[PDB]
Amino acid sequence: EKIVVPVQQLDPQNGNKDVGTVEITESAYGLVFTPKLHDLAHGLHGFHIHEKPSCEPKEKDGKLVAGLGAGGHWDPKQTQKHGYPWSDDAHMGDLPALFVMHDGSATTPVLAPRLKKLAEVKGHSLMIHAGGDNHSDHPAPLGGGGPRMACGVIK
Amino acid sequence: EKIVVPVQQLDPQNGNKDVGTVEITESAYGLVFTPKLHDLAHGLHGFHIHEKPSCEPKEKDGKLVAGLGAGGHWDPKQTQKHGYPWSDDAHMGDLPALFVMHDGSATTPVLAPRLKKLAEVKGHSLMIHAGGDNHSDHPAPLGGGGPRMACGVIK
Ligand SMILES: [Cu+2]
Ligand SMILES: [Cu+2]
Ligand SMILES: [Zn+2]
Ligand SMILES: [Zn+2]
């Protein structure tokens, strides 16, 4: 079985747009995230589980900012460090980056070896960023994902 | 402790070009392959350990085939099935696909959770294909990777 996460491209002004789903399954080596997404910007994108079960915007420094309602990276073990999916020093929410092909589709599965059971990711959000992910806070915070492009709540 | 694998772009007629290295390290969750490659074709490429410690071409039907001296996918258990990096029913050498950015660089690390110690992969080859990898023999054999584009021997 699979958790089916509906994902939307975020637009706080005009309303989110559906871009498909990400399926989460259990493998013998951890949780697999299998995207079935469309109409996204081509490239490799930061892909993380964020703390709050929300994809809503929040105002910050006078701005209505996409996805801020999700809070920060999911970090139950309180490492306070963005890092690699296979590093025990990194946020539990840190997943391998997600590849979107030329035609805007994403169908390449990725493994989160530190996550072991479907139950454990529910009540959090799944975030796809505009930027990539160097799995460090240096030199850009949170791997340089930057803006929150697409998001779905894990239920 | 690491293995540094020198990688060459394969051209049996005009000569193989040095395109960098891939560093293999041990993580708490299996082997991590960290590429440091340049001047490769952009996109997502099939990435596997092949059986033989060779990147040499081999004649077939009167023509040299790039990388054919590497033999098939490394499959010590003789599953005879191309599959996911996280599936125990798949070739032991099946790694996550390798992403090359538009500038020709590959620097995105990937985890092979079924591989646990550096000793396991010594005496084999590391292959990068022209095509991608859907982690099945359906609809295309060996994930659709097709031609052998770059290769290094793991020592
Ligand atoms: Cu994020
Ligand atoms: Cu191969
Ligand atoms: Zn993080
Ligand atoms: Zn294979």
Side-chain angles (χ1 to χ4, degrees):
Chain A
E1 84 286 19
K2 68 189 173 182
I3 303 170
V4 171
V5 182
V7 173
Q8 297 186 312
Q9 181 165 144
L10 301 185
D11 178 351
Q13 297 296 311
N14 312 318
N16 300 349
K17 175 203 141 147
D18 297 347
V19 292
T21 60
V22 175
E23 301 177 347
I24 311 177
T25 51
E26 296 177 0
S27 84
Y29 299 92
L31 299 190
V32 174
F33 296 70
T34 299
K36 291 185 184 182
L37 305 163
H38 59 85
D39 294 300
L40 291 175
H42 167 56
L44 193 69
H45 294 275
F47 183 45
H48 333 107
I49 302 179
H50 286 234
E51 168 50 41
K52 294 171 188 176
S54 178
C55 294
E56 299 301 303
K58 281 201 178 91
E59 287 187 27
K60 179 166 87 141
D61 309 350
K63 292 199 176 198
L64 196 61
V65 177
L68 293 190
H73 294 196
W74 176 43
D75 187 25
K77 296 181 188 168
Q78 291 294 295
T79 64
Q80 300 270 22
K81 170 179 188 202
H82 183 71
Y84 295 93
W86 45 80
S87 177
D88 292 312
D89 302 314
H91 304 131
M92 205 69 157
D94 293 347
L95 318 171
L98 182 144
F99 179 56
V100 175
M101 304 199 175
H102 94 251
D103 66 4
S105 70
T107 60
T108 297
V110 300
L111 176 72
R114 294 182 287 137
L115 308 182
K116 304 296 193 178
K117 305 291 281 197
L118 296 184
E120 82 183 277
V121 298
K122 297 170 172 182
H124 300 294
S125 46
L126 188 60
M127 198 68 74
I128 311 175
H129 292 259
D133 195 345
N134 78 341
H135 298 293
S136 178
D137 295 288
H138 170 88
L142 302 167
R148 295 171 189 208
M149 176 181 73
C151 180
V153 176
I154 310 169
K155 192 180 182 173
Chain B
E1 186 187 4
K2 59 154 107 147
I3 303 170
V4 179
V5 180
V7 173
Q8 53 197 265
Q9 177 164 53
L10 307 178
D11 187 326
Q13 302 306 313
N14 306 317
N16 300 342
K17 262 219 24 164
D18 194 339
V19 292
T21 54
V22 174
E23 297 183 352
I24 315 179
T25 49
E26 281 161 10
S27 83
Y29 301 93
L31 297 190
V32 177
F33 296 71
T34 305
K36 196 22 171 191
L37 303 169
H38 57 95
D39 293 304
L40 298 174
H42 164 73
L44 194 73
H45 298 270
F47 188 42
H48 332 110
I49 301 178
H50 286 234
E51 172 54 35
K52 305 178 185 194
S54 169
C55 291
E56 299 191 24
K58 183 171 176 183
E59 181 272 332
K60 176 166 182 161
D61 300 303
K63 305 142 191 274
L64 276 183
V65 180
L68 192 57
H73 294 198
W74 174 47
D75 187 25
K77 299 304 207 154
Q78 301 293 299
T79 63
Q80 295 175 95
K81 180 189 176 175
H82 183 70
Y84 294 100
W86 42 85
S87 177
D88 289 311
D89 69 356
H91 305 140
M92 195 62 62
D94 294 342
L95 316 173
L98 179 109
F99 177 61
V100 179
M101 299 193 76
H102 280 117
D103 70 357
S105 64
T107 58
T108 302
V110 296
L111 170 75
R114 296 190 282 132
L115 312 179
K116 298 303 195 186
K117 294 181 191 190
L118 298 170
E120 295 189 49
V121 295
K122 283 182 188 180
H124 299 298
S125 43
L126 184 63
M127 194 74 68
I128 304 164
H129 292 263
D133 198 340
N134 78 340
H135 300 295
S136 180
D137 291 305
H138 186 265
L142 301 167
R148 300 171 189 205
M149 174 182 81
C151 183
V153 175
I154 309 170
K155 292 182 195 168

PDB file of all heavy atoms in Angstrom, chain B residues 126-155:
ATOM      1  N   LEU B 126      31.864   0.783 -12.905  1.00  0.00           N
ATOM      2  CA  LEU B 126      30.781   1.749 -12.638  1.00  0.00           C
ATOM      3  C   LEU B 126      30.372   2.358 -13.953  1.00  0.00           C
ATOM      4  O   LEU B 126      31.189   2.997 -14.603  1.00  0.00           O
ATOM      5  CB  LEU B 126      31.296   2.796 -11.682  1.00  0.00           C
ATOM      6  CG  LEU B 126      30.328   3.861 -11.177  1.00  0.00           C
ATOM      7  CD1 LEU B 126      29.199   3.186 -10.367  1.00  0.00           C
ATOM      8  CD2 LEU B 126      30.988   4.906 -10.347  1.00  0.00           C
ATOM      9  N   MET B 127      29.142   2.144 -14.401  1.00  0.00           N
ATOM     10  CA  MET B 127      28.694   2.538 -15.706  1.00  0.00           C
ATOM     11  C   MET B 127      27.648   3.636 -15.695  1.00  0.00           C
ATOM     12  O   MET B 127      26.736   3.612 -14.836  1.00  0.00           O
ATOM     13  CB  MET B 127      28.098   1.308 -16.401  1.00  0.00           C
ATOM     14  CG  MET B 127      27.885   1.462 -17.905  1.00  0.00           C
ATOM     15  SD  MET B 127      29.468   1.379 -18.775  1.00  0.00           S
ATOM     16  CE  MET B 127      29.913  -0.301 -18.504  1.00  0.00           C
ATOM     17  N   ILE B 128      27.776   4.603 -16.603  1.00  0.00           N
ATOM     18  CA  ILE B 128      26.780   5.639 -16.840  1.00  0.00           C
ATOM     19  C   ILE B 128      26.270   5.504 -18.243  1.00  0.00           C
ATOM     20  O   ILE B 128      27.062   5.482 -19.190  1.00  0.00           O
ATOM     21  CB  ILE B 128      27.385   7.070 -16.619  1.00  0.00           C
ATOM     22  CG1 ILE B 128      27.985   7.165 -15.204  1.00  0.00           C
ATOM     23  CG2 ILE B 128      26.314   8.140 -16.780  1.00  0.00           C
ATOM     24  CD1 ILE B 128      28.938   8.353 -15.018  1.00  0.00           C
ATOM     25  N   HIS B 129      24.954   5.368 -18.419  1.00  0.00           N
ATOM     26  CA  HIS B 129      24.380   5.156 -19.726  1.00  0.00           C
ATOM     27  C   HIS B 129      23.876   6.442 -20.371  1.00  0.00           C
ATOM     28  O   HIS B 129      23.695   7.473 -19.751  1.00  0.00           O
ATOM     29  CB  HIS B 129      23.202   4.178 -19.589  1.00  0.00           C
ATOM     30  CG  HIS B 129      23.628   2.808 -19.216  1.00  0.00           C
ATOM     31  ND1 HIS B 129      23.810   1.802 -20.139  1.00  0.00           N
ATOM     32  CD2 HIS B 129      24.001   2.288 -18.016  1.00  0.00           C
ATOM     33  CE1 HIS B 129      24.218   0.708 -19.519  1.00  0.00           C
ATOM     34  NE2 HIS B 129      24.353   0.978 -18.224  1.00  0.00           N
ATOM     35  N   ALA B 130      23.636   6.364 -21.682  1.00  0.00           N
ATOM     36  CA  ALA B 130      23.050   7.489 -22.395  1.00  0.00           C
ATOM     37  C   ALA B 130      21.615   7.785 -21.978  1.00  0.00           C
ATOM     38  O   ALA B 130      21.228   8.949 -21.865  1.00  0.00           O
ATOM     39  CB  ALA B 130      23.098   7.240 -23.888  1.00  0.00           C
ATOM     40  N   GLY B 131      20.845   6.697 -21.863  1.00  0.00           N
ATOM     41  CA  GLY B 131      19.438   6.734 -21.465  1.00  0.00           C
ATOM     42  C   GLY B 131      19.271   6.806 -19.966  1.00  0.00           C
ATOM     43  O   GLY B 131      20.240   6.821 -19.202  1.00  0.00           O
ATOM     44  N   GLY B 132      18.008   6.825 -19.565  1.00  0.00           N
ATOM     45  CA  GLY B 132      17.636   6.857 -18.160  1.00  0.00           C
ATOM     46  C   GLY B 132      17.543   5.494 -17.516  1.00  0.00           C
ATOM     47  O   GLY B 132      18.238   4.553 -17.893  1.00  0.00           O
ATOM     48  N   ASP B 133      16.693   5.402 -16.478  1.00  0.00           N
ATOM     49  CA  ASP B 133      16.487   4.123 -15.779  1.00  0.00           C
ATOM     50  C   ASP B 133      15.143   4.125 -15.107  1.00  0.00           C
ATOM     51  O   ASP B 133      14.958   4.854 -14.143  1.00  0.00           O
ATOM     52  CB  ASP B 133      17.534   3.934 -14.697  1.00  0.00           C
ATOM     53  CG  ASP B 133      17.658   2.506 -14.242  1.00  0.00           C
ATOM     54  OD1 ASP B 133      16.720   1.678 -14.458  1.00  0.00           O
ATOM     55  OD2 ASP B 133      18.696   2.097 -13.666  1.00  0.00           O
ATOM     56  N   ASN B 134      14.191   3.364 -15.622  1.00  0.00           N
ATOM     57  CA  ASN B 134      12.907   3.224 -14.917  1.00  0.00           C
ATOM     58  C   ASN B 134      12.867   2.021 -13.965  1.00  0.00           C
ATOM     59  O   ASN B 134      11.803   1.630 -13.424  1.00  0.00           O
ATOM     60  CB  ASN B 134      11.742   3.153 -15.903  1.00  0.00           C
ATOM     61  CG  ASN B 134      11.607   1.823 -16.549  1.00  0.00           C
ATOM     62  OD1 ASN B 134      12.552   1.016 -16.582  1.00  0.00           O
ATOM     63  ND2 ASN B 134      10.400   1.548 -17.102  1.00  0.00           N
ATOM     64  N   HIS B 135      14.026   1.462 -13.658  1.00  0.00           N
ATOM     65  CA  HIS B 135      14.157   0.386 -12.716  1.00  0.00           C
ATOM     66  C   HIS B 135      13.279  -0.798 -13.021  1.00  0.00           C
ATOM     67  O   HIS B 135      12.778  -1.485 -12.135  1.00  0.00           O
ATOM     68  CB  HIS B 135      13.942   0.896 -11.284  1.00  0.00           C
ATOM     69  CG  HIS B 135      14.942   1.957 -10.885  1.00  0.00           C
ATOM     70  ND1 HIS B 135      16.287   1.690 -10.774  1.00  0.00           N
ATOM     71  CD2 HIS B 135      14.800   3.281 -10.653  1.00  0.00           C
ATOM     72  CE1 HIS B 135      16.937   2.809 -10.493  1.00  0.00           C
ATOM     73  NE2 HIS B 135      16.060   3.791 -10.390  1.00  0.00           N
ATOM     74  N   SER B 136      13.122  -1.080 -14.310  1.00  0.00           N
ATOM     75  CA  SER B 136      12.434  -2.309 -14.763  1.00  0.00           C
ATOM     76  C   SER B 136      13.050  -2.755 -16.091  1.00  0.00           C
ATOM     77  O   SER B 136      13.696  -1.958 -16.770  1.00  0.00           O
ATOM     78  CB  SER B 136      10.965  -1.985 -14.941  1.00  0.00           C
ATOM     79  OG  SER B 136      10.215  -3.110 -15.366  1.00  0.00           O
ATOM     80  N   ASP B 137      12.816  -4.023 -16.434  1.00  0.00           N
ATOM     81  CA  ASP B 137      13.054  -4.518 -17.784  1.00  0.00           C
ATOM     82  C   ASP B 137      11.842  -4.311 -18.676  1.00  0.00           C
ATOM     83  O   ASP B 137      11.871  -4.691 -19.840  1.00  0.00           O
ATOM     84  CB  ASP B 137      13.433  -5.994 -17.736  1.00  0.00           C
ATOM     85  CG  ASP B 137      14.758  -6.232 -17.131  1.00  0.00           C
ATOM     86  OD1 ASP B 137      15.769  -5.633 -17.604  1.00  0.00           O
ATOM     87  OD2 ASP B 137      14.894  -7.077 -16.220  1.00  0.00           O
ATOM     88  N   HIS B 138      10.779  -3.690 -18.159  1.00  0.00           N
ATOM     89  CA  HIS B 138       9.604  -3.292 -18.951  1.00  0.00           C
ATOM     90  C   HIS B 138       9.440  -1.772 -19.048  1.00  0.00           C
ATOM     91  O   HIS B 138       9.490  -1.118 -18.013  1.00  0.00           O
ATOM     92  CB  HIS B 138       8.341  -3.853 -18.286  1.00  0.00           C
ATOM     93  CG  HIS B 138       7.127  -3.608 -19.101  1.00  0.00           C
ATOM     94  ND1 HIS B 138       6.295  -2.526 -18.904  1.00  0.00           N
ATOM     95  CD2 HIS B 138       6.659  -4.256 -20.186  1.00  0.00           C
ATOM     96  CE1 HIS B 138       5.335  -2.550 -19.813  1.00  0.00           C
ATOM     97  NE2 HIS B 138       5.538  -3.590 -20.603  1.00  0.00           N
ATOM     98  N   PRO B 139       9.225  -1.137 -20.198  1.00  0.00           N
ATOM     99  CA  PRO B 139       9.143  -1.806 -21.508  1.00  0.00           C
ATOM    100  C   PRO B 139      10.478  -2.100 -22.182  1.00  0.00           C
ATOM    101  O   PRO B 139      10.524  -2.926 -23.123  1.00  0.00           O
ATOM    102  CB  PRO B 139       8.386  -0.803 -22.343  1.00  0.00           C
ATOM    103  CG  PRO B 139       8.790   0.563 -21.765  1.00  0.00           C
ATOM    104  CD  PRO B 139       9.014   0.308 -20.310  1.00  0.00           C
ATOM    105  N   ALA B 140      11.553  -1.440 -21.749  1.00  0.00           N
ATOM    106  CA  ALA B 140      12.891  -1.590 -22.327  1.00  0.00           C
ATOM    107  C   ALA B 140      13.782  -2.413 -21.385  1.00  0.00           C
ATOM    108  O   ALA B 140      13.778  -2.254 -20.157  1.00  0.00           O
ATOM    109  CB  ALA B 140      13.501  -0.237 -22.589  1.00  0.00           C
ATOM    110  N   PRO B 141      14.623  -3.274 -21.925  1.00  0.00           N
ATOM    111  CA  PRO B 141      15.572  -3.982 -21.123  1.00  0.00           C
ATOM    112  C   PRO B 141      16.438  -3.050 -20.258  1.00  0.00           C
ATOM    113  O   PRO B 141      16.820  -1.963 -20.708  1.00  0.00           O
ATOM    114  CB  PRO B 141      16.494  -4.637 -22.171  1.00  0.00           C
ATOM    115  CG  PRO B 141      15.659  -4.807 -23.316  1.00  0.00           C
ATOM    116  CD  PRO B 141      14.737  -3.611 -23.361  1.00  0.00           C
ATOM    117  N   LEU B 142      16.771  -3.510 -19.055  1.00  0.00           N
ATOM    118  CA  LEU B 142      17.777  -2.856 -18.219  1.00  0.00           C
ATOM    119  C   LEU B 142      17.447  -1.380 -17.987  1.00  0.00           C
ATOM    120  O   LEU B 142      18.332  -0.485 -17.922  1.00  0.00           O
ATOM    121  CB  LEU B 142      19.166  -3.010 -18.872  1.00  0.00           C
ATOM    122  CG  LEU B 142      19.509  -4.469 -19.034  1.00  0.00           C
ATOM    123  CD1 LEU B 142      20.729  -4.611 -19.957  1.00  0.00           C
ATOM    124  CD2 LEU B 142      19.730  -5.195 -17.730  1.00  0.00           C
ATOM    125  N   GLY B 143      16.149  -1.100 -17.749  1.00  0.00           N
ATOM    126  CA  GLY B 143      15.679   0.239 -17.485  1.00  0.00           C
ATOM    127  C   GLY B 143      15.666   1.272 -18.572  1.00  0.00           C
ATOM    128  O   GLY B 143      15.388   2.429 -18.324  1.00  0.00           O
ATOM    129  N   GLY B 144      15.966   0.849 -19.813  1.00  0.00           N
ATOM    130  CA  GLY B 144      16.123   1.771 -20.912  1.00  0.00           C
ATOM    131  C   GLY B 144      17.401   2.588 -20.991  1.00  0.00           C
ATOM    132  O   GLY B 144      17.466   3.608 -21.670  1.00  0.00           O
ATOM    133  N   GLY B 145      18.425   2.144 -20.287  1.00  0.00           N
ATOM    134  CA  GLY B 145      19.681   2.901 -20.250  1.00  0.00           C
ATOM    135  C   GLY B 145      20.358   2.932 -21.623  1.00  0.00           C
ATOM    136  O   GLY B 145      21.019   3.905 -21.968  1.00  0.00           O
ATOM    137  N   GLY B 146      20.206   1.868 -22.382  1.00  0.00           N
ATOM    138  CA  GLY B 146      20.775   1.862 -23.740  1.00  0.00           C
ATOM    139  C   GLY B 146      22.303   1.945 -23.708  1.00  0.00           C
ATOM    140  O   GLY B 146      22.925   1.317 -22.867  1.00  0.00           O
ATOM    141  N   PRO B 147      22.884   2.672 -24.660  1.00  0.00           N
ATOM    142  CA  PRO B 147      24.337   2.725 -24.804  1.00  0.00           C
ATOM    143  C   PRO B 147      25.101   3.104 -23.525  1.00  0.00           C
ATOM    144  O   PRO B 147      24.583   3.836 -22.659  1.00  0.00           O
ATOM    145  CB  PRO B 147      24.545   3.786 -25.865  1.00  0.00           C
ATOM    146  CG  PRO B 147      23.354   3.749 -26.665  1.00  0.00           C
ATOM    147  CD  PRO B 147      22.211   3.457 -25.709  1.00  0.00           C
ATOM    148  N   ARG B 148      26.341   2.632 -23.469  1.00  0.00           N
ATOM    149  CA  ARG B 148      27.260   2.934 -22.378  1.00  0.00           C
ATOM    150  C   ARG B 148      28.034   4.195 -22.671  1.00  0.00           C
ATOM    151  O   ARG B 148      28.794   4.261 -23.659  1.00  0.00           O
ATOM    152  CB  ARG B 148      28.187   1.762 -22.181  1.00  0.00           C
ATOM    153  CG  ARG B 148      27.420   0.467 -21.837  1.00  0.00           C
ATOM    154  CD  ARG B 148      28.201  -0.826 -21.818  1.00  0.00           C
ATOM    155  NE  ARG B 148      27.271  -1.945 -21.691  1.00  0.00           N
ATOM    156  CZ  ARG B 148      27.548  -3.135 -21.199  1.00  0.00           C
ATOM    157  NH1 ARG B 148      28.745  -3.454 -20.721  1.00  0.00           N
ATOM    158  NH2 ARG B 148      26.576  -4.026 -21.145  1.00  0.00           N
ATOM    159  N   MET B 149      27.810   5.221 -21.871  1.00  0.00           N
ATOM    160  CA  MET B 149      28.278   6.545 -22.183  1.00  0.00           C
ATOM    161  C   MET B 149      29.573   6.890 -21.481  1.00  0.00           C
ATOM    162  O   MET B 149      30.419   7.565 -22.077  1.00  0.00           O
ATOM    163  CB  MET B 149      27.177   7.559 -21.850  1.00  0.00           C
ATOM    164  CG  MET B 149      27.535   9.053 -21.991  1.00  0.00           C
ATOM    165  SD  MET B 149      26.204  10.230 -21.522  1.00  0.00           S
ATOM    166  CE  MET B 149      26.364  10.266 -19.759  1.00  0.00           C
ATOM    167  N   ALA B 150      29.702   6.513 -20.227  1.00  0.00           N
ATOM    168  CA  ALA B 150      30.921   6.746 -19.439  1.00  0.00           C
ATOM    169  C   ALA B 150      31.078   5.598 -18.461  1.00  0.00           C
ATOM    170  O   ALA B 150      30.105   4.937 -18.093  1.00  0.00           O
ATOM    171  CB  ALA B 150      30.871   8.094 -18.753  1.00  0.00           C
ATOM    172  N   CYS B 151      32.306   5.356 -18.015  1.00  0.00           N
ATOM    173  CA  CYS B 151      32.625   4.200 -17.223  1.00  0.00           C
ATOM    174  C   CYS B 151      33.912   4.413 -16.408  1.00  0.00           C
ATOM    175  O   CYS B 151      34.790   5.147 -16.851  1.00  0.00           O
ATOM    176  CB  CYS B 151      32.768   3.008 -18.154  1.00  0.00           C
ATOM    177  SG  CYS B 151      33.088   1.398 -17.441  1.00  0.00           S
ATOM    178  N   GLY B 152      33.984   3.804 -15.243  1.00  0.00           N
ATOM    179  CA  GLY B 152      35.217   3.683 -14.471  1.00  0.00           C
ATOM    180  C   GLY B 152      35.354   2.353 -13.796  1.00  0.00           C
ATOM    181  O   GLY B 152      34.382   1.690 -13.472  1.00  0.00           O
ATOM    182  N   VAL B 153      36.588   1.896 -13.605  1.00  0.00           N
ATOM    183  CA  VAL B 153      36.841   0.666 -12.924  1.00  0.00           C
ATOM    184  C   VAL B 153      36.968   0.895 -11.397  1.00  0.00           C
ATOM    185  O   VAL B 153      37.700   1.816 -10.940  1.00  0.00           O
ATOM    186  CB  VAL B 153      38.127  -0.019 -13.458  1.00  0.00           C
ATOM    187  CG1 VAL B 153      38.432  -1.239 -12.644  1.00  0.00           C
ATOM    188  CG2 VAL B 153      37.926  -0.397 -14.935  1.00  0.00           C
ATOM    189  N   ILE B 154      36.267   0.083 -10.607  1.00  0.00           N
ATOM    190  CA  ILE B 154      36.284   0.192  -9.143  1.00  0.00           C
ATOM    191  C   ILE B 154      37.367  -0.763  -8.578  1.00  0.00           C
ATOM    192  O   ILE B 154      37.249  -1.988  -8.704  1.00  0.00           O
ATOM    193  CB  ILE B 154      34.906  -0.144  -8.566  1.00  0.00           C
ATOM    194  CG1 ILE B 154      33.796   0.655  -9.274  1.00  0.00           C
ATOM    195  CG2 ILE B 154      34.873   0.157  -7.079  1.00  0.00           C
ATOM    196  CD1 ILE B 154      32.381   0.169  -8.889  1.00  0.00           C
ATOM    197  N   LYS B 155      38.398  -0.162  -7.992  1.00  0.00           N
ATOM    198  CA  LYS B 155      39.605  -0.846  -7.478  1.00  0.00           C
ATOM    199  C   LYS B 155      39.774  -0.538  -5.998  1.00  0.00           C
ATOM    200  O   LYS B 155      39.372   0.529  -5.535  1.00  0.00           O
ATOM    201  CB  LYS B 155      40.865  -0.309  -8.183  1.00  0.00           C
ATOM    202  CG  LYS B 155      41.017  -0.623  -9.649  1.00  0.00           C
ATOM    203  CD  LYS B 155      42.356  -0.052 -10.156  1.00  0.00           C
ATOM    204  CE  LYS B 155      42.456   0.021 -11.703  1.00  0.00           C
ATOM    205  NZ  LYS B 155      43.660   0.842 -12.150  1.00  0.00           N
TER     206      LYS B 155
END
